[PDB]
Amino acid sequence: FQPTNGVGYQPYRVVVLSFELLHAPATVCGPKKSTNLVKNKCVNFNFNG
């Protein structure tokens, strides 16, 4: 090997993080980013679901 190996011969690091859903607990969330909290106005609220 060489420090400047080309594609196909150079080392290839791989991570295979796997998504699993079974009888094991399902602690799955969504892409919910926090937003400012308003008051004294008719609004659609979602606190913890």
Partner: protein, 40 residues
């Protein structure tokens, strides 16, 4: 769980006291037997 000072020993104390939740681990396993531990 709950903690409360009592006076009786051989019998459970008189009174009412609710217990608050303390831990909610999602262990996701099934348990059919249990045992206590002691310090000697």
């Amino acid at each position: 769980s709950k903690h409360t000072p009592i006076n009786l020993v051989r019998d459970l104390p008189q009174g009412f006291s609710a217990l608050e939740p303390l831990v909610d681990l999602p262990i996701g396993i099934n348990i059919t037997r249990f045992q206590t531990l002691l310090a000697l």
